[PDB]
């Protein structure tokens, strides 16, 4: 069970949440299994609206949105579309100041394999 | 709070004083009486009867005929309160 493997390895040594949610709120829930709150639907709605908005720029399709907040609340996301053409899947993860700038790219590196398969 | 759109009776396929979208108002059936009033009521509210259900409108919009809005001092493109009242009270 690779889900329990990453559920021990990406919730312990860097302390980040992981959401692999989508448009219709099929919640791949909190990987430390904390309280869910209302930040998931807000972040997923903002990411889908930002992925809709940034297609109209000249630079092309977005790969990632690295949204750094103050005093160590830095959030990175990667949005990828569904294979059956029914929407998009985001990959939300929240960390500290230097916790994102570091081993969080490992967590999104496993999460993009998850969103592929 | 819903946006107030005006239409013309007999124009564009609309033959009623009130056009109610069923996907905006799922609790409104045929023959109901709909109270349309201003926020912070200055004038009398408007009561109209539902005679058709068309899905051409967008969300949070209710279509009233232009002369009915001109009689009741309803400004177009404004917020209105949409409520359903019993026929025995009015």
């Amino acid at each position: 069970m690779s889900v329990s493997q990453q559920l021990s390895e990406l919730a312990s040594k860097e302390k980040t949440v992981l959401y692999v949610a989508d448009q219709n709120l099929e919640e791949v829930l909190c990987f430390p299994e904390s309280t869910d709150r209302t930040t998931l639907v807000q972040l997923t709605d903002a990411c889908l609206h930002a992925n809709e908005l940034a297609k109209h720029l000249e630079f092309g399709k977005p790969l990632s949105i690295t949204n750094q907040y103050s005093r160590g609340s830095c959030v990175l996301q990667i949005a990828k579309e569904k294979k059956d053409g029914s929407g998009m899947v985001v990959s939300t993860t929240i960390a500290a100041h230097n916790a994102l700038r570091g081993a969080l790219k490992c967590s999104n590196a496993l999460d993009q394999v998850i969103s592929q398969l | 709070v819903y946006k107030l759109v005006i239409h013309k009776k007999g124009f564009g396929g609309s033959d009623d004083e009130l056009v109610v979208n069923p996907k905006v108002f799922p609790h409104i059936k045929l023959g109901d009486i709909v109270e349309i009033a201003h926020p912070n009521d200055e004038y009398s509210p408007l009561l109209l009867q539902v005679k058709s259900l068309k899905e051409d409108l967008q969300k949070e919009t209710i279509s009233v005929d232009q002369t009915v809005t001109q009689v009741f001092r309803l400004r177009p493109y404004q917020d209105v309160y949409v409520n359903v009242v019993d026929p025995k009270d009015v």
């Binding site: 230097n98 994102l100 700038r101 570091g102 081993a103 969080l104 790219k105 490992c106 590196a109 | -």
Partner: protein, 81 residues
């Protein structure tokens, strides 16, 4: 890019270290030499407790010299052969 940082990065690259890689804790700031075909994301995602490490890929033959202090990482690219 400043001129003194550009000449310092040119002083980083030589006939021994064929590639220079300057990077913050998460974001790159300066590149020199042959920095392509991965070998940059593994420097960006790198984090460890100690300060002096030597790393090479087990599916490649490129050896990287890595130092990290004051939230700034320097990477030197040279072939393991």
């Amino acid at each position: 890019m400043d001129s003194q940082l550009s000449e310092n990065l040119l002083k980083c690259v030589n006939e021994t270290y064929r590639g220079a890689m300057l990077v913050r804790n998460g974001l790159p700031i300066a590149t020199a030499g042959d920095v392509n075909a991965e070998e940059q994301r593994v420097i960006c995602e790198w984090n460890s407790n100690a300060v002096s490490e030597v790393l090479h890929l087990h599916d490649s033959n490129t050896k990287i010299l890595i130092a990290t202090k004051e939230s700034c990482v320097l990477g030197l690219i040279y072939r393991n052969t």
